Amino acid sequence: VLRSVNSREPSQVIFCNRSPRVVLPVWLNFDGEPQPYPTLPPGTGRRIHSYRGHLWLFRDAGTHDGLLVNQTELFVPSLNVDGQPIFANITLPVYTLKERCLQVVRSLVKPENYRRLDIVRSLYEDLEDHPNVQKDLERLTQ
Amino acid sequence: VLRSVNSREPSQVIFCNRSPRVVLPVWLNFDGEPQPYPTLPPGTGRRIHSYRGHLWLFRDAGTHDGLLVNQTELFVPSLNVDGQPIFANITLPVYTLKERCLQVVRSLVKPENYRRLDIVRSLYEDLEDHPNVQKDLERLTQE
Amino acid sequence: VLRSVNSREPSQVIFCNRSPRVVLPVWLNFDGEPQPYPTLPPGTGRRIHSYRGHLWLFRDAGTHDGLLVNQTELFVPSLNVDGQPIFANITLPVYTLKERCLQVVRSLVKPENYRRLDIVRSLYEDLEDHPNVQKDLERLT
Amino acid sequence: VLRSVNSREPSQVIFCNRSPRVVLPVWLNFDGEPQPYPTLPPGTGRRIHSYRGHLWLFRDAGTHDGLLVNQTELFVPSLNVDGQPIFANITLPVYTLKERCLQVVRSLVKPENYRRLDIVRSLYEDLEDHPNVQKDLERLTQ
Amino acid sequence: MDVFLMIRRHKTTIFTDAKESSTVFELKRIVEGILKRPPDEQRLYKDDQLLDDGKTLGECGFTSQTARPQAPATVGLAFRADDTFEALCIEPFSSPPELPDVMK
Amino acid sequence: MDVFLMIRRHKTTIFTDAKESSTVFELKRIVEGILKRPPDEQRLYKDDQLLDDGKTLGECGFTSQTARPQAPATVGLAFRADDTFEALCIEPFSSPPELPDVMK
Amino acid sequence: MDVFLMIRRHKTTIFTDAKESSTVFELKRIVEGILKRPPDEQRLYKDDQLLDDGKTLGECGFTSQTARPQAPATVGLAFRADDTFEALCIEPFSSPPELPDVMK
Amino acid sequence: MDVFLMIRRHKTTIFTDAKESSTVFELKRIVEGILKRPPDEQRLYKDDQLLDDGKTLGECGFTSQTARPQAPATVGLAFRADDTFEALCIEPFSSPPELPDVMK
Amino acid sequence: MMYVKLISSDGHEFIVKREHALTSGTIKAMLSTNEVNFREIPSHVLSKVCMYFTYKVRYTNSSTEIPEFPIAPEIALELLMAANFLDC
Amino acid sequence: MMYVKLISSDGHEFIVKREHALTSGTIKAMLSTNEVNFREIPSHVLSKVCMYFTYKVRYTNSSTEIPEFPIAPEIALELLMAANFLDC
Amino acid sequence: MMYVKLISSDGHEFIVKREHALTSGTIKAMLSNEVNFREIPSHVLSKVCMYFTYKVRYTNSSTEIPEFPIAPEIALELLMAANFLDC
Amino acid sequence: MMYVKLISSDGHEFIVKREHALTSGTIKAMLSNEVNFREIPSHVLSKVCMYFTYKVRYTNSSTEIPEFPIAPEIALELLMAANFLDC
Ligand SMILES: Cc1cc(-c2scnc2C)ccc1[C@H](C)NC(=O)[C@@H]1C[C@@H](O)CN1C(=O)[C@@H](NC(=O)C1(F)CC1)C(C)(C)C
Ligand SMILES: Cc1cc(-c2scnc2C)ccc1[C@H](C)NC(=O)[C@@H]1C[C@@H](O)CN1C(=O)[C@@H](NC(=O)C1(F)CC1)C(C)(C)C
């Protein structure tokens, strides 16, 4: 469903991390399979080569939390007009307070010790629902 | 000593009773003698005619308890500015607890039965030492 | 000092009240005594008869507030060249803010209730020193 | 010694209170006697009439604490050039730390309880010698 | 407006004043400074009615004209014995003797 | 002939003069010289009506006989906070007390 | 610039924003609309320092980079009891419990 | 202008002055001259907020009218023992006694 | 401010502001502690005494109309003796 | 503007702008009233709830770099339980 | 032109031209670009500035000078203000 | 410049400029780069150290000098310290 097109038409892009987190770039290959690419430290940028019609999304490298690129979920390289590269602005979403609390707790509690916290059973299942790219791709595919 | 001065210069005064007691106004003559004047029920007022330099004090009509006028013991009619009369605010003093207790006992016991109460002789002599104006006038004269 | 010359020379004048106030024309007599003449309602004007060398001053009729005539304090009728009358423009001076404030309060408080005002006692002495013609004549002298 | 001279020569003065204290203006007469004048609230100004060679000083109206006028103790009206009045800038002195503590304690304890404070006998005599204009005048004379 | 109060618990009676606009919790802070017990362990009563922390003393019926210096209002206090709050107990004051005959 | 104006914003009041032939833009330049904010970031009002930069003051109803030195006319001022213009806010002056009795 | 502020008095906390150029008095006008007390009866504090009505928020050290939406700056508030202003009192928030073992 | 500061770490208190234009890094350089610790091993805080090396003291909310000689502003200090920075700990000052009755 | 405790004959403990208690010169001497025992004054008297302290501080040197201090007849004799001993 | 009051379990009263509070559909429903009481959310948690309202209103729909929402570890669990009940 | 700021007791800020303000030698002395008057409220200081403009406009003028208008409700405070500033 | 340390009774260590500290001749005598003050708590020395800054700043100043602030609860102990330090 969600796939890169093998156009073979190159396109230069600036990957620009405007977030306090280390960013994992994820490219959706021709089979639709997510492939991780080199990470970008917070506040850094890199000039990369890709192609027109390719699909990319971006996550936190340590937790796989979803991130925004140009205020949307998916980024598709276009044609470089006048040699100017396409600029990809990776930023933090405005998370819900619930997701933000889950992130902080996941970073503080080992996965084995989730069911030992004094919370409702529902939040233990929420803590185990760690963000993962493959699952969300199927949600959009449906 | 404490006397009114025969000035012959009129002065209109408001006698304002801001006390729960019936007030007896007392004018000190040019000879120093206390003269009783008409009484005022609680919360009442009267417009009177006096004179500059005259001396007045105020007591309870039933017990001769001391009262305050403009937060002091004696009131002297002064000059009426723009014809406006002078205001005499007759109010309760903050009595000592002992003097206030004596007042209640005097009001409940006949003087004849003072020496029958179970108290020290000192408190009996104090109950018999009922407020009296001349006494107080000589005390202020000493001051 | 300040008196009018008995020159016996007629001289016609236009007393023009360019002020919001009722005007009192004051002529100084030969003895130097001020003599007041008929008032002039605001915005009016009259052709009058006086003489060369006579001294005139103008005030508010109700308050004796000093007023300017031809940009100055005193007017003196001059020579009627070719039958033109001499013109006298009575205008409001630029009062200081204090005098105008003294004016407004004076116009509002009876002279006995000055001492009942919530103001410094110096201002009580100012409110009573209201304008006075003989006062101004002694000042110039 | 310290007295005003009768010059009969007028001089207009601005009294400008740039202090947080209510200021008492004190004029020393031709005999040297201090005369108190109308007080000035903090941050206020007044245009007054005085004379060449007259002597003026300024104190706290409630405590007679010393204050400065044009950064010194005494003020002498000089020539009004072009009719412009002379400017008297009344400010706080930089009190010694000891005197300033005495000021706070004096404002908090009634004089009757000075000898009840737990201090050295020297400090009790220091609290009772509260500022006095005549005393300061004879000190400047000496 | 000033209100004058007797806060009573058992044989303990505290005389103090507060504002008609002051809250019940601020009164608990005053009891805390005196008897050294935190507000969490305090419960204040007007007669039998439990007083809520946020309401003002005026709202709870303590007014400058009923809580007077010469005749203050009574506010009951009950402390918390670790996990259970005690019942409200205000011990009465002594009783006066019979009026002597000379006063009847 | 000159018109005398009060340019008012919040608790700020500017006293200035201009001519009936002057434009609203030129007035905004005077303000810029005073408050150091450019005309594109300013909005001027006569009462609640927005004034157009190109119109002359005479056109917008400011005349030599209503905008007087001893009683100037009020022109509202509104600045642009970042990207959005603020509302026109003019703080009233203090209110005088009641007339003393001897003056009534 | 927008600055984000916590106005705190006793157990009362107002969350509001203003401009870095806005003044202490306009901020008091915001308190007036909420707590129904005139600016005359209010004193605002940065820590223990009394703030002057005419000063701007930037001047009092309230800046967009220290007064943040997710971490606002605290401004103390003190009201006037009858004739005297109360002392500045800000009740602290509740303190959190100990970290659980699985979180240590 | 000039700002007057107390740099606080544990029981250490440094009294110094700087400019509103000075940066946090330059302030760390003065701490280096006094406490003999390089700026890389220093972290400066305003209350709980970390101060960034490049920002000016004015930007971080330290202004001449809040950082006064008679009442300086407090800046927290935290050192690196080797690779880890310690938490901020500013030891409180001593507590004053209660007031004599003759003084209350 | 500071508070003092006044204990009656019956065990009742009345906590009043120290300045209020210092009105009574007798109590002043008994303190120079923060507590005093009165082995002759019952609670129904000492409470009315404590109200009197509040009344004296509140209305002394006031232009506002002073209200009567009320004393019930049944306690008048015991309050009288207490007031004589406390000199208030 | 329009303001609403949120009272925590320990009595602290938080006044926020109504538009900021309408972020939580839960709070919006609980208001349609100018006051809401939370008998289980303490002030150390409810204060951060109001900060989140401000942070959300400010940074929603922003190209400018949004900063992280800061949550101290000591309050992470109690804020989580609060956020689950309010679903915000 | 150069402007001066006059701040009243209630915080209102009045910006007037320096030349108009130099009318009062009092103000000129208080300048040697902002002066704060903690005794003069805004309903008074506003007409004070109105007086500045009126004086500069009508001093040395032959054209008919109008009255300086003063409402009764403020007459007393401006009088007290004018006595101290002597303008 | 040179810096000196003033150590209070409860162990607090105050780092002040040397020039500011010699204001007090008492301290100057105790130096001729560290001093211990028994009897002087940290809540008193803090204000002393601040007084120095205030004095150096507003001494001989045309700019309006502010009140030096001393809280009532500490006024007595600072007085004795000021008496001993002669500042
Ligand atoms: C190695 C590398 C790292 C980074 C990153 S990311 C964060 N930091 C760094 C340094 C950014 C680009 C690259 C290389 C130069 N660039 C690609 O890998 C592009 C991107 C995507 O568009 C897929 N891709 C192809 O090269 C693909 N080749 C083709 O599509 C064709 F040859 C038919 C046209 C495949 C993979 C060989 C299948
Ligand atoms: C009759 C009366 C009742 C009340 C009172 S009181 C409480 N309710 C009410 C209605 C208040 C004033 C009055 C009369 C009208 N007013 C006076 O009696 C004044 C008062 C004092 O000032 C003395 N006095 C003189 O009239 C004295 N006359 C003179 O001194 C002179 F003729 C030489 C100047 C003598 C006595 C006649 C000797």
Ligand SMILES: Cc1cc(-c2scnc2C)ccc1[C@H](C)NC(=O)[C@@H]1C[C@@H](O)CN1C(=O)[C@@H](NC(=O)C1(F)CC1)C(C)(C)C
């Ligand atoms: C009555 C009158 C009212 C108005 C005025 S004013 C405002 N509305 C109105 C209608 C204007 C002129 C007049 C009369 C016609 N005019 C004068 O009163 C002149 C003016 C002054 O200059 C003095 N004067 C003499 O007539 C003097 N006579 C002489 O000088 C001589 F006979 C020696 C030459 C004396 C006085 C009689 C002593």
Ligand SMILES: Cc1cc(-c2scnc2C)ccc1[C@H](C)NC(=O)[C@@H]1C[C@@H](O)CN1C(=O)[C@@H](NC(=O)C1(F)CC1)C(C)(C)C
């Ligand atoms: C009443 C008043 C209050 C204030 C003040 S202060 C703070 N707020 C306010 C309103 C300011 C000036 C004044 C009066 C108008 N001004 C003086 O009192 C001057 C000052 C000094 O210079 C002495 N003085 C003379 O007028 C002296 N007169 C003379 O020396 C001569 F006539 C022979 C030359 C004597 C005293 C009459 C003897």
